[PDB]
Amino acid sequence: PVSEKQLAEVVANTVTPLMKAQSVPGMAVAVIYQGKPHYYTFGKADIAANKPVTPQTLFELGSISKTFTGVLGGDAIARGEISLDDPVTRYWPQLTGKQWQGIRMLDLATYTAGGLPLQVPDEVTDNASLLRFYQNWQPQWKPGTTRLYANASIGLFGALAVKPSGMPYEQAMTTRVLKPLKLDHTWINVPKAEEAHYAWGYRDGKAVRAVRVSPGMLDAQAYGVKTNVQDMANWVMANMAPENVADASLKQGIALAQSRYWRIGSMYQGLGWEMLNWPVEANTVVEGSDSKVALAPLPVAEVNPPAPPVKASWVHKTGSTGGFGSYVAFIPEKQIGIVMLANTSYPNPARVEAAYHILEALQ
């Protein structure tokens, strides 16, 4: 087995050339191995202020935020508040357009509603306009036939999933997922006293941060989660080993998020999380991460009933914002995982290659 000394070498030997090649100012990495996190920090959180990355530095997760949504929605299912087999309209009766008949909460959660686009457009600036957008939407495909990765799909799922609880998404997420897991430095809105920890993002040499979008049911999902490498490490450990999560509905929700709902070539869609069977070769994972594939509308095979979590899985998610690029992957059968948080958005294939190389060293 690999020692902590050897692991430190592997991580440094992988990350240092990556940051140079991709011009990454700073990275925080956690590797989960032998039951605990191992933390490695590199570079700068703020170039001009010459602030180093630390295990307290906050990074924008981008679409890794969807894994929190997925688990929150799984928790709501486990509570009995929603069912993935319910129609969307059960949770939004004002959505009267008949094109919605036969579209389930499942389809919104897993991008199979039939062509909801990647983005909610910017003229959506309130809920009246959000309704008009979904009412006007004309599906390109029937439900349950085509996967098209989409913020307009899972974002609406997350907004509807929390409606029975009576809480907005941010409060539901904080109350039901973050606090029970002691993720006490994980934020949608970074508090005042925590801003000194917030890294700057970098894009073509310019320091940038995520902007808030227009107030409405999706605003928190869109502004996205910010967190440090410690909380992300503990997020990965909770998802890798939900048997240690005490709250019964949250443990079930973690499992629902890693269940397989659809097969799309070599991958399977969960709630936010995506999975491949393990063992998997690097090129499979890397090639799937290319935007020409990841953004494409692709046919699905339904997994009916959904398959509960498969321990021999590569479970992962990439996420980016204008200034940040992050990746998380874990293998429950092996009880190993990795978090890589960076303050530049560098190519997803490069993220996967580096993560794969590090985890390969530990098996």
Side-chain angles (χ1 to χ4, degrees), residues 1-35 37-43 45-181 183-191 193-194 196-205 207-211 213-291 293-310 312-333 335-363:
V2 161
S3 69
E4 287 183 30
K5 181 160 66 184
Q6 290 167 315
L7 176 60
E9 292 183 8
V10 172
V11 173
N13 286 348
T14 300
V15 168
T16 291
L18 174 66
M19 295 170 67
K20 166 179 179 168
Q22 298 297 341
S23 303
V24 181
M27 288 192 86
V29 181
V31 177
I32 309 310
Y33 180 53
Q34 304 186 322
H38 309 255
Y39 299 114
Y40 311 94
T41 55
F42 307 82
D46 184 331
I47 298 177
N50 191 14
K51 294 181 197 162
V53 175
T54 75
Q56 303 185 75
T57 301
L58 304 168
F59 298 80
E60 298 169 4
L61 287 183
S63 296
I64 300 171
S65 302
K66 293 178 173 75
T67 66
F68 292 87
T69 301
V71 169
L72 183 59
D75 178 85
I77 298 161
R79 287 171 178 268
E81 289 171 340
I82 73 166
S83 175
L84 296 171
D85 292 331
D86 288 339
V88 174
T89 53
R90 172 175 186 88
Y91 301 106
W92 206 0
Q94 296 83 357
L95 189 67
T96 54
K98 295 286 185 206
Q99 70 276 30
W100 288 92
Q101 178 187 49
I103 304 183
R104 299 171 290 164
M105 290 285 275
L106 175 65
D107 297 301
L108 282 184
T110 56
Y111 324 115
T112 58
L116 286 170
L118 180 62
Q119 326 281 6
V120 181
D122 286 338
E123 69 264 39
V124 175
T125 56
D126 64 7
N127 293 167
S129 51
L130 191 69
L131 178 65
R132 282 192 275 266
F133 167 67
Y134 286 109
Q135 284 282 66
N136 167 267
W137 169 67
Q138 296 189 243
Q140 187 155 8
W141 296 284
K142 312 167 300 129
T145 66
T146 298
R147 183 184 176 277
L148 179 66
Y149 180 85
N151 302 315
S153 185
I154 190 173
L156 182 60
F157 169 73
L160 299 183
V162 297
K163 281 175 83 165
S165 74
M167 295 179 275
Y169 177 90
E170 179 187 2
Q171 179 169 233
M173 174 72 70
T174 300
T175 298
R176 290 180 171 189
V177 175
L178 305 179
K179 291 322 237 175
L181 293 177
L183 307 176
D184 294 328
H185 302 261
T186 299
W187 315 102
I188 306 305
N189 293 293
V190 172
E194 303 296 331
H197 296 119
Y198 193 177
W200 280 93
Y202 289 95
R203 172 137 64 153
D204 195 30
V208 299
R209 284 182 178 157
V211 283
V213 305
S214 294
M217 343 160 150
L218 314 202
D219 59 8
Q221 297 88 305
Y223 186 29
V225 174
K226 296 78 152 157
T227 185
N228 64 43
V229 75
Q230 296 176 88
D231 280 15
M232 269 312 266
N234 282 292
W235 180 238
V236 175
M237 298 184 92
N239 278 272
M240 300 170 43
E243 51 265 36
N244 300 320
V245 170
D247 292 332
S249 65
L250 182 57
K251 170 207 295 296
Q252 281 188 29
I254 291 167
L256 290 168
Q258 264 168 75
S259 302
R260 290 107 172 278
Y261 297 90
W262 305 99
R263 187 173 69 69
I264 314 88
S266 306
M267 56 82 56
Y268 307 80
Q269 184 67 53
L271 312 178
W273 295 111
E274 297 173 24
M275 289 82 64
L276 300 86
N277 293 333
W278 184 261
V280 67
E281 309 278 0
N283 62 348
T284 297
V285 195
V286 173
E287 292 172 24
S289 77
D290 195 283
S291 65
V293 175
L295 299 180
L298 297 173
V300 302
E302 189 180 32
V303 185
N304 181 214
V310 174
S313 295
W314 176 276
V315 186
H316 71 160
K317 189 72 182 82
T318 201
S320 308
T321 62
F324 294 78
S326 297
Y327 184 61
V328 295
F330 57 91
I331 305 163
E333 177 188 22
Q335 291 289 311
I336 64 182
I338 191 170
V339 177
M340 306 164 61
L341 307 180
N343 61 351
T344 208
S345 186
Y346 63 100
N348 290 318
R351 306 180 202 181
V352 177
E353 172 67 18
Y356 191 98
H357 183 76
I358 295 163
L359 291 190
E360 176 177 63
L362 294 179
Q363 335 139 2

Short mmCIF file of all heavy atoms in Angstrom, two decimals, residues 111-145:
data_model
loop_
_atom_site.label_atom_id
_atom_site.label_comp_id
_atom_site.label_asym_id
_atom_site.label_seq_id
_atom_site.Cartn_x
_atom_site.Cartn_y
_atom_site.Cartn_z
N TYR A 111 -32.15 15.56 -16.58
CA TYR A 111 -31.93 16.22 -17.87
C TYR A 111 -32.67 15.52 -19.02
O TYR A 111 -32.20 15.67 -20.18
CB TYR A 111 -30.45 16.41 -18.23
CG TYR A 111 -29.50 16.73 -17.11
CD1 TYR A 111 -28.51 15.85 -16.76
CD2 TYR A 111 -29.61 17.91 -16.40
CE1 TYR A 111 -27.65 16.14 -15.74
CE2 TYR A 111 -28.74 18.20 -15.35
CZ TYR A 111 -27.74 17.31 -15.05
OH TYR A 111 -26.90 17.63 -13.99
N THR A 112 -33.74 14.79 -18.74
CA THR A 112 -34.45 14.02 -19.77
C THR A 112 -35.85 14.56 -20.08
O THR A 112 -36.68 13.84 -20.63
CB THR A 112 -34.53 12.53 -19.39
OG1 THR A 112 -35.19 12.44 -18.12
CG2 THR A 112 -33.15 11.94 -19.23
N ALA A 113 -36.12 15.81 -19.75
CA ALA A 113 -37.46 16.35 -20.03
C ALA A 113 -37.80 16.48 -21.50
O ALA A 113 -38.98 16.52 -21.85
CB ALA A 113 -37.64 17.70 -19.31
N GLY A 114 -36.78 16.53 -22.34
CA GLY A 114 -36.94 16.53 -23.79
C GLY A 114 -36.42 17.80 -24.44
O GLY A 114 -37.01 18.28 -25.42
N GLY A 115 -35.31 18.33 -23.94
CA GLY A 115 -34.64 19.43 -24.62
C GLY A 115 -34.64 20.72 -23.87
O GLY A 115 -34.40 21.72 -24.50
N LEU A 116 -34.95 20.77 -22.57
CA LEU A 116 -34.75 22.01 -21.83
C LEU A 116 -33.30 22.44 -22.06
O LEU A 116 -32.40 21.62 -22.02
CB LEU A 116 -35.02 21.83 -20.34
CG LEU A 116 -36.51 21.71 -19.95
CD1 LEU A 116 -36.66 21.30 -18.51
CD2 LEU A 116 -37.21 23.04 -20.25
N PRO A 117 -33.15 23.71 -22.36
CA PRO A 117 -31.81 24.18 -22.74
C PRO A 117 -30.87 24.35 -21.57
O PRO A 117 -31.25 24.39 -20.41
CB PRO A 117 -32.16 25.54 -23.37
CG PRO A 117 -33.37 25.99 -22.62
CD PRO A 117 -34.18 24.73 -22.44
N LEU A 118 -29.59 24.47 -21.92
CA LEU A 118 -28.52 24.57 -20.96
C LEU A 118 -28.78 25.66 -19.93
O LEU A 118 -28.66 25.44 -18.72
CB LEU A 118 -27.19 24.81 -21.68
CG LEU A 118 -25.96 24.94 -20.76
CD1 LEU A 118 -25.67 23.70 -19.95
CD2 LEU A 118 -24.74 25.27 -21.63
N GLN A 119 -29.15 26.84 -20.38
CA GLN A 119 -29.35 28.01 -19.56
C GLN A 119 -30.81 28.46 -19.53
O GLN A 119 -31.52 28.41 -20.51
CB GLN A 119 -28.52 29.19 -20.06
CG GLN A 119 -27.17 28.77 -20.65
CD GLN A 119 -26.18 28.49 -19.53
OE1 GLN A 119 -26.58 28.53 -18.36
NE2 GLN A 119 -24.92 28.22 -19.87
N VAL A 120 -31.18 28.95 -18.33
CA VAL A 120 -32.34 29.82 -18.23
C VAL A 120 -31.91 31.15 -18.81
O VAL A 120 -30.86 31.69 -18.44
CB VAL A 120 -32.75 29.96 -16.77
CG1 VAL A 120 -33.97 30.85 -16.62
CG2 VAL A 120 -33.03 28.59 -16.14
N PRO A 121 -32.66 31.71 -19.74
CA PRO A 121 -32.17 32.92 -20.40
C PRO A 121 -32.22 34.11 -19.47
O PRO A 121 -32.96 34.20 -18.52
CB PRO A 121 -33.12 33.09 -21.59
CG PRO A 121 -34.36 32.43 -21.15
CD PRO A 121 -33.94 31.30 -20.26
N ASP A 122 -31.38 35.06 -19.85
CA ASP A 122 -31.22 36.22 -18.97
C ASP A 122 -32.44 37.12 -18.87
O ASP A 122 -32.54 37.90 -17.90
CB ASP A 122 -30.00 37.02 -19.48
CG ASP A 122 -28.67 36.35 -19.16
OD1 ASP A 122 -28.59 35.51 -18.21
OD2 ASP A 122 -27.67 36.64 -19.85
N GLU A 123 -33.40 37.06 -19.80
CA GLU A 123 -34.60 37.89 -19.58
C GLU A 123 -35.50 37.32 -18.50
O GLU A 123 -36.49 37.94 -18.09
CB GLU A 123 -35.48 38.05 -20.81
CG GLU A 123 -36.16 36.71 -21.15
CD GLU A 123 -35.30 36.05 -22.22
OE1 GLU A 123 -34.07 36.22 -22.04
OE2 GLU A 123 -35.83 35.46 -23.19
N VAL A 124 -35.15 36.13 -18.04
CA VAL A 124 -35.89 35.65 -16.88
C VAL A 124 -35.32 36.35 -15.66
O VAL A 124 -34.18 36.09 -15.30
CB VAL A 124 -35.85 34.13 -16.75
CG1 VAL A 124 -36.55 33.70 -15.45
CG2 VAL A 124 -36.53 33.48 -17.96
N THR A 125 -36.15 37.24 -15.11
CA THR A 125 -35.68 38.09 -14.02
C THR A 125 -36.57 38.05 -12.79
O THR A 125 -36.34 38.79 -11.85
CB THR A 125 -35.59 39.55 -14.52
OG1 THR A 125 -36.87 39.93 -15.02
CG2 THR A 125 -34.59 39.65 -15.68
N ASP A 126 -37.58 37.18 -12.83
CA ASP A 126 -38.50 36.98 -11.73
C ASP A 126 -39.35 35.74 -11.99
O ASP A 126 -39.20 35.15 -13.06
CB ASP A 126 -39.40 38.18 -11.50
CG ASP A 126 -40.35 38.54 -12.60
OD1 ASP A 126 -40.50 37.82 -13.60
OD2 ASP A 126 -41.01 39.61 -12.43
N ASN A 127 -40.21 35.38 -11.04
CA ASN A 127 -40.99 34.16 -11.26
C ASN A 127 -42.06 34.24 -12.30
O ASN A 127 -42.29 33.20 -12.93
CB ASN A 127 -41.56 33.77 -9.89
CG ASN A 127 -40.56 33.32 -8.88
OD1 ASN A 127 -40.76 33.19 -7.68
ND2 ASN A 127 -39.31 33.07 -9.21
N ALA A 128 -42.65 35.40 -12.50
CA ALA A 128 -43.58 35.51 -13.61
C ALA A 128 -42.90 35.18 -14.93
O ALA A 128 -43.46 34.50 -15.76
CB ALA A 128 -44.14 36.90 -13.68
N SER A 129 -41.70 35.72 -15.09
CA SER A 129 -40.98 35.45 -16.33
C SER A 129 -40.43 34.02 -16.39
O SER A 129 -40.30 33.49 -17.51
CB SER A 129 -39.86 36.46 -16.55
OG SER A 129 -39.03 36.59 -15.43
N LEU A 130 -40.11 33.45 -15.25
CA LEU A 130 -39.68 32.05 -15.22
C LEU A 130 -40.81 31.15 -15.69
O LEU A 130 -40.65 30.24 -16.51
CB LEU A 130 -39.20 31.68 -13.82
CG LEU A 130 -38.48 30.34 -13.73
CD1 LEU A 130 -37.13 30.32 -14.42
CD2 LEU A 130 -38.33 29.94 -12.27
N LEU A 131 -42.03 31.42 -15.21
CA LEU A 131 -43.21 30.70 -15.68
C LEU A 131 -43.42 30.88 -17.17
O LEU A 131 -43.66 29.92 -17.91
CB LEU A 131 -44.45 31.12 -14.88
CG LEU A 131 -45.77 30.47 -15.29
CD1 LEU A 131 -45.77 28.97 -15.04
CD2 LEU A 131 -46.91 31.14 -14.54
N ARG A 132 -43.32 32.11 -17.65
CA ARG A 132 -43.52 32.31 -19.09
C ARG A 132 -42.51 31.52 -19.91
O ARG A 132 -42.83 30.94 -20.94
CB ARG A 132 -43.50 33.81 -19.45
CG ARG A 132 -44.86 34.40 -19.05
CD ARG A 132 -45.07 35.80 -19.63
NE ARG A 132 -44.45 36.71 -18.69
CZ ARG A 132 -44.87 37.42 -17.65
NH1 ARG A 132 -46.13 37.42 -17.23
NH2 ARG A 132 -43.95 38.16 -17.02
N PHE A 133 -41.26 31.44 -19.45
CA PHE A 133 -40.24 30.66 -20.14
C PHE A 133 -40.63 29.19 -20.21
O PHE A 133 -40.56 28.59 -21.30
CB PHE A 133 -38.92 30.83 -19.40
CG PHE A 133 -37.84 29.86 -19.81
CD1 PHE A 133 -37.24 29.87 -21.06
CD2 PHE A 133 -37.42 28.89 -18.91
CE1 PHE A 133 -36.27 28.94 -21.42
CE2 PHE A 133 -36.45 27.96 -19.25
CZ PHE A 133 -35.87 27.98 -20.51
N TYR A 134 -40.99 28.58 -19.10
CA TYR A 134 -41.31 27.15 -19.13
C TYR A 134 -42.63 26.88 -19.84
O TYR A 134 -42.77 25.81 -20.43
CB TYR A 134 -41.31 26.59 -17.71
CG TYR A 134 -39.92 26.43 -17.14
CD1 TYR A 134 -39.50 27.27 -16.12
CD2 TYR A 134 -39.01 25.49 -17.58
CE1 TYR A 134 -38.22 27.16 -15.58
CE2 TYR A 134 -37.73 25.37 -17.03
CZ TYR A 134 -37.33 26.22 -16.02
OH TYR A 134 -36.08 26.14 -15.44
N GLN A 135 -43.55 27.83 -19.79
CA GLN A 135 -44.82 27.67 -20.49
C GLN A 135 -44.63 27.71 -22.01
O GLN A 135 -45.34 27.06 -22.75
CB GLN A 135 -45.79 28.76 -20.09
CG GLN A 135 -46.42 28.60 -18.71
CD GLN A 135 -47.53 27.59 -18.74
OE1 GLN A 135 -47.38 26.39 -18.95
NE2 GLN A 135 -48.75 28.08 -18.50
N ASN A 136 -43.70 28.53 -22.45
CA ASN A 136 -43.45 28.74 -23.88
C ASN A 136 -42.56 27.63 -24.46
O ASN A 136 -42.56 27.43 -25.65
CB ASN A 136 -42.81 30.13 -24.07
CG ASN A 136 -42.24 30.33 -25.47
OD1 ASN A 136 -41.06 30.09 -25.73
ND2 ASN A 136 -43.11 30.79 -26.38
N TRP A 137 -41.81 26.91 -23.63
CA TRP A 137 -40.85 25.92 -24.08
C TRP A 137 -41.55 24.80 -24.84
O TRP A 137 -42.54 24.26 -24.35
CB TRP A 137 -40.09 25.35 -22.88
CG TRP A 137 -39.27 24.16 -23.20
CD1 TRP A 137 -38.15 24.08 -23.99
CD2 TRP A 137 -39.52 22.83 -22.74
NE1 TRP A 137 -37.68 22.77 -24.02
CE2 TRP A 137 -38.52 21.99 -23.26
CE3 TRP A 137 -40.51 22.28 -21.91
CZ2 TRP A 137 -38.48 20.64 -23.00
CZ3 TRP A 137 -40.45 20.93 -21.66
CH2 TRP A 137 -39.44 20.11 -22.19
N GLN A 138 -41.01 24.50 -26.02
CA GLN A 138 -41.48 23.44 -26.90
C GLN A 138 -40.50 22.29 -26.89
O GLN A 138 -39.40 22.47 -27.45
CB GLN A 138 -41.64 23.98 -28.32
CG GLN A 138 -42.69 25.05 -28.42
CD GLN A 138 -43.05 25.49 -29.82
OE1 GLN A 138 -42.84 26.67 -30.18
NE2 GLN A 138 -43.62 24.64 -30.65
N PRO A 139 -40.80 21.15 -26.31
CA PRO A 139 -39.83 20.05 -26.27
C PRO A 139 -39.45 19.57 -27.65
O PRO A 139 -40.31 19.35 -28.51
CB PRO A 139 -40.53 18.92 -25.53
CG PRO A 139 -41.91 19.37 -25.32
CD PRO A 139 -42.06 20.84 -25.63
N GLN A 140 -38.16 19.36 -27.86
CA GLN A 140 -37.65 18.79 -29.11
C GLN A 140 -37.82 17.29 -29.18
O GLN A 140 -37.87 16.69 -30.24
CB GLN A 140 -36.17 19.16 -29.23
CG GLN A 140 -35.57 18.77 -30.58
CD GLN A 140 -34.37 19.63 -30.92
OE1 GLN A 140 -33.90 20.42 -30.08
NE2 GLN A 140 -33.92 19.47 -32.16
N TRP A 141 -37.88 16.64 -28.01
CA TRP A 141 -38.01 15.20 -27.88
C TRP A 141 -39.08 14.84 -26.87
O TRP A 141 -39.40 15.68 -26.01
CB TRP A 141 -36.69 14.61 -27.36
CG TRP A 141 -35.58 14.82 -28.33
CD1 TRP A 141 -35.40 14.11 -29.50
CD2 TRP A 141 -34.53 15.78 -28.23
NE1 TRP A 141 -34.28 14.59 -30.12
CE2 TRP A 141 -33.74 15.60 -29.38
CE3 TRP A 141 -34.21 16.75 -27.29
CZ2 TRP A 141 -32.60 16.37 -29.64
CZ3 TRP A 141 -33.09 17.51 -27.54
CH2 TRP A 141 -32.32 17.30 -28.69
N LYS A 142 -39.61 13.64 -26.94
CA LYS A 142 -40.49 13.16 -25.88
C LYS A 142 -39.70 12.95 -24.58
O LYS A 142 -38.50 12.78 -24.61
CB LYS A 142 -41.10 11.83 -26.25
CG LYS A 142 -41.70 11.68 -27.63
CD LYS A 142 -41.99 10.22 -27.97
CE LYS A 142 -40.82 9.25 -27.97
NZ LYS A 142 -40.95 7.97 -27.18
N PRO A 143 -40.42 12.95 -23.46
CA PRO A 143 -39.72 12.76 -22.20
C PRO A 143 -39.09 11.39 -22.15
O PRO A 143 -39.54 10.41 -22.72
CB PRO A 143 -40.81 12.84 -21.12
CG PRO A 143 -42.07 13.21 -21.80
CD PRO A 143 -41.88 13.13 -23.27
N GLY A 144 -37.99 11.32 -21.42
CA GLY A 144 -37.38 10.02 -21.15
C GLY A 144 -36.70 9.40 -22.36
O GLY A 144 -36.53 8.18 -22.38
N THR A 145 -36.28 10.24 -23.31
CA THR A 145 -35.63 9.72 -24.51
C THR A 145 -34.24 10.29 -24.77
O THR A 145 -33.41 9.59 -25.37
CB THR A 145 -36.47 9.95 -25.78
OG1 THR A 145 -36.58 11.33 -26.05
CG2 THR A 145 -37.86 9.39 -25.57
#
